[model samples]
Target: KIEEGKLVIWINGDKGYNGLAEVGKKFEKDTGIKVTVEHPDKLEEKFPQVAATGDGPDIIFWAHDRFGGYAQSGLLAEITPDKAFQDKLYPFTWDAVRYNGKLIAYPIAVEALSLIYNKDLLPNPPKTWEEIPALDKELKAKGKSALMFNLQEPYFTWPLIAADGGYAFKYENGKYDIKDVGVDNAGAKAGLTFLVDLIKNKHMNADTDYSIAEAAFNKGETAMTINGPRAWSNIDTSKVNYGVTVLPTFKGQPSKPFVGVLSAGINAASPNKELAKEFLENYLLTDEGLEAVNKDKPLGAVALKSYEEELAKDPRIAATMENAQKGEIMPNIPQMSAFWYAVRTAVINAASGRQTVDEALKDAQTRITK
Candidate 1:
């Protein structure tokens, strides 16, 4: 079962694997077990197939969103840690990795959307949505947009829609009550109306999507955009004098974006299960190990408390940490499939004038329930 002293790990990105490569070197030197960190193609598709046949790598890293489906299928091993270990990481991350009361992965980092702005164009990002109109008017004189992001996508717009209390499902008793959809509520209406108003007033464009907005921001054509750390790679830092901060509040209430946890999971049938566990617990959990990983693929909000201080020195990471505090953990339940489709449809319908915000959200609630 040792497989000739080799331990394999499959991760998605090149930088992610590069970081692990260093950790692997340390692992091989410490335990004499050769470590192979791989950047595989179509991982979401391939991992399930290979893992199910018990031929996959010993460890794999992915978003916690996938953990629920995997855990439900018995594809992952429980990794509940000691109380002290739990205390060292952000509490929301621990909550994200749990499935039916079992800890299915080790939360490595967390990410949430922030108000990223062009400092040369705006000087300071708006602290409240109320201030945006004046900024929009001012920027229009300079032939620029005040803010831009994908208006139809739920992931990008949820913070604005749910700023006052909108949500997809009712989270109760440490679990989601999928029966209770909250997107059709009053708070949700206010949020969606606010977004629609921006379009109607020509302050923002309904046509602007992730690609559109990101390109504009990189070119310094937009004053502000809502995005997360992953977008950092695409930003042309040399061209755009940018700054990252928490999203502007709605009616004095903070906009709560989705907090996504990135985690490391072990193969349930891995031959070197104990060794893999040791590798994660002893090597991957250390400050040096985390730093190595983040050094290649910069982390947003590091899950480990020991590493937070150093990671936060980076303004992007610091903004992410503060923003994540006002965020909601994206529900990892399989029912989320319906929630995504419903919200996207709702936003598109309302933003395009195919339906009113109330009608759109009401339809969304109906669609999710069925």
Candidate 2:
């Protein structure tokens, strides 16, 4: 409440937060005000509760998917950026932070999962879903799996649903209708059926979950996988010779992934609200500020045009951005919570074969609707 001369911020140490701390130090040197960065084991888990108590940090660095809940709960300071500042970022970047027509935060990193393949083994990325079966045969003969992923996870499984023309909610008239969930439709069935066939045929197995797949890829035992930008950091290009591209085509339809972003928001209860905004607009957006943020790790495609131009130079990061631009933006509303749980359950149930894809989806739809 007084001239505190210091600002507090909470951020998860992962995803370039360490780099942001360096930027914070520089900000302090440039501006008289000191900045302190705190690392919580999980910012998303700690944020809402802290902010509600009117004792949260002035700023919180987090992802866009949870911004809607925070904003609706009156825990976030709404951002009102001028067109010029807004125009400086990619349109989807700005749109990702919007909650119920109000901009909830400042968009930072935009990302999506893409198919990463061993260039030496794959040569060229798959152009159609048909290509995978034959490709699997070749890899199997070489004592390696053709593709591996955690099919049980909703985020990773989304492209298959999208390929079959499935979508979680209908976003119409600039708002999403939770009532119109499409998980039980023909599209969802078509998508899940493809995965079930692959699993049933031994082309892929439940044993090859995300952790197993990641280890397999790192050890050069798997030829391909579906993962987001963060996974790129673990790739040893010299060892894996991997290249990233958009998901393979599915029966003439492309695999549409989900676009998500990491963002920063001012806390509604912050005593230094104006200082937070000034720091973001004046210091964080500048060239030096952005370079420091991008220093230690690559954060996919940043919203700033200047930052994106540089990131595009990295082929891996560019592929993620390409899919992000082509994919559907995941909804950020609270209703999304229900979808994630039910959708994953539906995937697992369908794979188990006890329930039909339709039955599983219906069960999922009922859970959310109820």
Candidate 3:
């Protein structure tokens, strides 16, 4: 009886809650279980704290990074596999949701940065980074660029080094080896230096935030940009026929972008455990459920191979799908928690000319180890 009327869920991000809630109505009508979604703010700070009370959400939607934090706090339920488990999702998605070798969440979508270019501005499509400089000069806004991106943040900047043989961590023995830091190496310096010159000598500014970069490209103000698919939610695409790709090969090497997974995890503290498990294990994994969950959400691919195979034929996802195959999966570990803010700070300092690339990276290395 309890299983029939109670399946409540709490989403963490503000993105695509409507899509989830809409199908939740279908689920309620079809199965009579309640599905409530919050998409609460301050999830990073609020969830582990609230969940300790043993009365938080039944399920939480978030990226793979937070899975480790929740698992360590004993606030997440292990993803108990079912009959469909082995064939339901991709290995990388399964790998993303695992913590200390136990499955902790259900994987849904994949995200990664790639090149987004306006078809009109770049019909020939510059596949090499070397072509952007002269093209930027030719645009003649002098203050403008043929290419623009938020190089001020490390997330947008690190792929440059990844192309040049640099890396974040050495994954070995089934874990991230913290001792193998590579950001301060020559490869990274080369990547950092080129971006440094783009801001310094090219027609760009030191503090181009996401809005500036995205707006420049979306408004047809710039010819090209390097970003992810998340920005496509509400654009007037008729005015701008844009296309996506992996970043232009950085000096003959394919750019190694970080692949991110968006996933759903059941709260170990759920008030209605059986129904929550029933809704997730049997219901959401179905094609109907997955489709509704993705409406208005431009998730380029599904972790489930069949669903992805169906969706990947859309052509819009071609670039994102290709990049996801080529990119590095973002590690979900405590060592990873140390990298984000510190490296972003390092890049900002270096990009803003407050510190040399070597100096900023060395400082970040110190920060990551500490």
Overall lDDT per candidate, in order of appearance: 0.85, 0.82, 0.76
The superposed Cα distance between candidate 3 and the true structure at residue 321, in angstroms, equals: 2.4
As for candidate 3, its clashing pairs are none
The better candidate by lDDT, 2 or 3, is 2
Model 3 / residue 81 / CA error / Å = 2.0
- Give one digit per residue, the lDDT tens place, for model 2 in 269-347: 8878788888887777766677877786666777788878887888877888888887878888899889999988888
- Residue 88, model 2, lDDT: 85
| Best-performing candidate as measured by lDDT | 1
The segments of candidate 1 whose C-alpha lies over 4 angstroms from its true place after superposition are 1-5
- TM-score winner between 1 and 3, please give it: 1
Quote the RMSD, in angstroms, for model 3: 3.0
TM-score on alpha carbons, each prediction: 0.95, 0.93, 0.88
* Ten-residue region with minimum lDDT total, candidate 3: 1-10
Candidate 1 lDDT by residue in tens digits, 18-43: 88899999999988889998878878
Clashing pairs in 1: none
